[PDB]
Amino acid sequence: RCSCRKSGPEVVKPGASVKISCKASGYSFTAYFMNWVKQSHGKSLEWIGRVNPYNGDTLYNQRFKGKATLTVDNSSRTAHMELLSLTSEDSAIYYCGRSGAYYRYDGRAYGMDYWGQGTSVTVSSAKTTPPSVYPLAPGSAAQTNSMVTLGCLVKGYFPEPVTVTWNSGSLSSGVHTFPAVLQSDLYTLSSSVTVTSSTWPSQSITCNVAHPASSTKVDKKIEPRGP
Amino acid sequence: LNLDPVQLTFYAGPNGSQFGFSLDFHKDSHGRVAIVVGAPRTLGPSQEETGGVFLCPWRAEGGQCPSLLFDLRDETRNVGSQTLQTFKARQGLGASVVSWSDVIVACAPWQHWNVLEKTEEAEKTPVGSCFLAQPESGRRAEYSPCRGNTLSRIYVENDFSWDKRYCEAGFSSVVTQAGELVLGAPGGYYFLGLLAQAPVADIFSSYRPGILLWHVSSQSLSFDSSNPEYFDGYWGYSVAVGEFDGDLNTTEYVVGAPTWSWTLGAVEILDSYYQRLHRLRGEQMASYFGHSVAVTDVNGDGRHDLLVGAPLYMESRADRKLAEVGRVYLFLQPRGPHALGAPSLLLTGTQLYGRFGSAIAPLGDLDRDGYNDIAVAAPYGGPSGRGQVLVFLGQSEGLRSRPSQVLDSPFPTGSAFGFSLRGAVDIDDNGYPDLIVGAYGANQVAVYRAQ
Amino acid sequence: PVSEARVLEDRPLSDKGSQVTQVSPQRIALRLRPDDSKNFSIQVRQVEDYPVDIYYLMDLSYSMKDDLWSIQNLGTKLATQMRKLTSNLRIGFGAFVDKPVSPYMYISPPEALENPCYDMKTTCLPMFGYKHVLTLTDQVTRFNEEVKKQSVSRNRDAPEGGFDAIMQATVCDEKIGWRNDASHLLVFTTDAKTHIALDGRLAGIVQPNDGQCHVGSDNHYSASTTMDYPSLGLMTEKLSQKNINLIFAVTENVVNLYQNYSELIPGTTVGVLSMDSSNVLQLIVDAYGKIRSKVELEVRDLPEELSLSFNATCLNNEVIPGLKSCMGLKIGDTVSFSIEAKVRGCPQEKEKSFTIKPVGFKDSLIVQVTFD
Amino acid sequence: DIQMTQSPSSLSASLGERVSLTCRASQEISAYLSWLQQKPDGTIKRLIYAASTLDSGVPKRFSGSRSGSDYSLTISSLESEDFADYYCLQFATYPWTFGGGTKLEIRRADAAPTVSIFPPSSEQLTSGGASVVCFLNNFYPKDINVKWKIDGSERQNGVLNSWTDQDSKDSTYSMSSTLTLTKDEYERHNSYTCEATHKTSTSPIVKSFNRNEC
Ligand SMILES: [Ca+2]
Ligand SMILES: [Ca+2]
Ligand SMILES: [Ca+2]
Ligand SMILES: [Ca+2]
Ligand SMILES: [Ca+2]
Ligand SMILES: [Mg+2]
Question: Fold for domain D4-106?
Fold first, then answer.
């Protein structure tokens, strides 16, 4: 039915400007308001403002008055928002919602329905780097009893989609990957696998890390620590 | 200028029937000219109003008329799991009448339709319908493009898209010279309005009595709009045809939307595929710019010009700022691909609440000088507020700003003298076109013969 | 003998209308000799608050279903500040939806007439055009209690029939309860478009509005389904005839439309119908709260033998001979009239009396004439 | 502006239970309120509008009924699909404001964490740094405390903790504590201890490893 398709992730510098879109289909697009909402890292949705597609009249929240300019393009049924003088506080996920403006029947608009998908904007001064990858083998004296755990550590990389797999997806059970944390403008992450005490080191357990941003694929083999 | 005001011809109908609401000229194969009158409140076979059509021959003394019989019985038909029902009580048959060749189209805009499927229905709504008649051969057919069998839940889920349930097809009608009937539906697409076009021969050849739902293989309907300017615009209040491109193979449609863009009003010129060629906007809000449209060449150069009527226009006076008198706009067609700019002429009424410009009738060359003329009706004009018809002559640069002749109502007050006019047809074989005026409040029609 | 005018009652004029005296002096004993004249002064001053009548027109359609609290909160605050401004206030209200005729109205199933609200889950009231609920009264608690009991109905299209309500509130005087000497204010509340003249042809109605009163004993507009909507000129003419001041209380989505309609109906104002208190409306009403009236004198029970001449003194000291009335006076202002009484001959009756009285006020000056 | 307050910040329930979430307004909103559900994915959907009206396709198990001050959303016969985050939106006066947010949690049989430690790798040692990772896996509930001891000395700076969302299969929780430091500082000490405090056991779980012990 109604679809609201938004643009992809953006990585911008602290002081530059970005422009994100929300293409709408499945409805008139001229009888409905176009609302933009910002959800920060710790939830807490905020209303940024709305734009009238019929006539480009914009109503803003006071907090975001001088930060975002809301425009429209009726030719391609696409709404836009531009953020100016980006800083580290604007890194969040932005949503486009649709609300009713003009009605042909005895009815009234009752809020924002049919939200978008979410566009993540990250503002930071760093460049694309490849990820350093290390193995995580257990202590020699801290032997396992019935369940053993191994890991792959990733650190020192920029924009963070990162695919971490074990044995090319063959070993999928008992695998937990932790979300990356940011330090010194660089991301770090870890992945853990648990297997039986007989599976390892009898077989080969490997971690494969793919980082599309830097186009880097690395395979590492988990080996026990020596004397 | 030369219409005779002393010797009038009077035609009368049944009392309370609104005889004279709509009227037209009709011609037989033999060439004799008669009048077709609609009476949208005539009593039916069960003492319930259904409307009627009367075929009045030409006698100098006037009088009563015979009625062209139609079918006035409600129909219920079982199709698979659905039941189709038509309701003709107070349908307003004869609200609009038109004639082409030997075919009379009389249209009832307030006929109701319903589809019942188990515990659901498509809701009882005024789709409108209308009847095609061949009196000489006694042939009868019907046309209703806005019927359907989609239940109301689907419409609710679609957000009322492509909703033709409240069409009221037959509010306004016109027939092109090729033989194609065009109907305006001011309530189509949820009161936005639409246009339905279909060849008359196809309508007669695609009709089977008993089947209440059928589709004409050659009909074309206008398109639904997403623009808020078109909401509640009543696109189809008035329709007309003309030549506005320079290509003689294609025909152009002129449509009035008197409430377009938040009660501002508009008149749009489109081609046969419902693509816009021009749009004239109103001058004042709520003045019903687009209530009446007319197409005729008054400049005498071969290019059709446009007349628009706004009966509720309020002029700025000295002793009354709001002098609701009415206005008529004249746009002249220029050479080449130039667009219709500012109005060429403005005519304004003098009597308060006179509704000047509520009917414009091209009279043809009334006095045979070389330029076409028009007639404008003020149904509540004149010092006594009875009604008036003003005749405007044509000259080399448009119309004459002063009326050449004024005709006053011969009926009591409240008769709506001038609600419908028809000219440009010679009825008594003297060489000068004549005029017929319908007053439905008195249920009568007056015939003026030009000298 | 010398003609004289001994002042009998000379109570000074009051300062606040909270007994109130508005004419000083109150009683004078005039004594005259044959064919003689004598002059004396009178002072008039307005120290009483001006009457006000307010009538509300409420939209009770489905779109205005959750906005009922907003329009019933305006009426608890609008009836409070006027109780601080004027002590003579009347408040009343009525409601409108639209013409109860197809295609404006659902007519199927036969259970949709009893409630148009049926294909949904809930229920809501049948359709009606315009009904008069509360006549102008000085009880505020009754007004609030009556307003709180109003629920909505449902129709098909977005424009509404709220102008028939305006005309029927304007021209029905004995039913609404308008006062002859008061300031009449008509508040019209809506949130959508409106139907105008010639719009009723889509229902089969072609008869023009006649501007007469069609509200009967059942307090319902009877000709709603018979005659067309009123036009702008007829509405303006009737509002001018009945001396009604029109205010548009509309939501923000439709403010500009009714702002464009106010240029075409002079003397009308537009506010906004918000959630909190509609402060724009209240400020506009208090701005109109400046209502300054006139002072005109009349003579009562004047004997034939006596003749009177008047010299007016309005604001400042601009004396106008041959005038007994002043305009442009503010509530609290004072004016003075010098009246000269001349007797013709000597009447047989020794004692007579007459009265000089401002128009529309109880206070008056009684002059007892004795012929010497 | 109008601030909306959501009473339950976090709610834990079992399948088939009945739960209710409350959202109250600072000012007066008549019936302008809507309820939104955000699934783990980032997709937001409107469940109830006008404070009591279900949307098209929402099961007749979600209900909301109140006006004036308080407002409620109720789920009866709670199912596995509807374990997400919920918000209230007022849209009564501009600017529009949202509720604080309520996240629904599945209650499942509390467990105890499995604690493991991993010494720094050789490649990081050659680079010039050293990272020590302690994994706490498969514990319930989500609240837990961790502590790092360097030769019996508590460390506060230079530690990063990363938690995971609740598992979709066993409904457990996992988290990792990473201590990153310079190679010289790491070589200056011998033993490193990871301590875990969980509500299941009063006695904390302690795992220690010594430098160069193989
Ligand atoms: Ca052409
Ligand atoms: Ca021409
Ligand atoms: Ca001529
Ligand atoms: Ca003739
Ligand atoms: Ca309506
Ligand atoms: Mg409404």
Answer: Immunoglobulin-like (2.60.40)
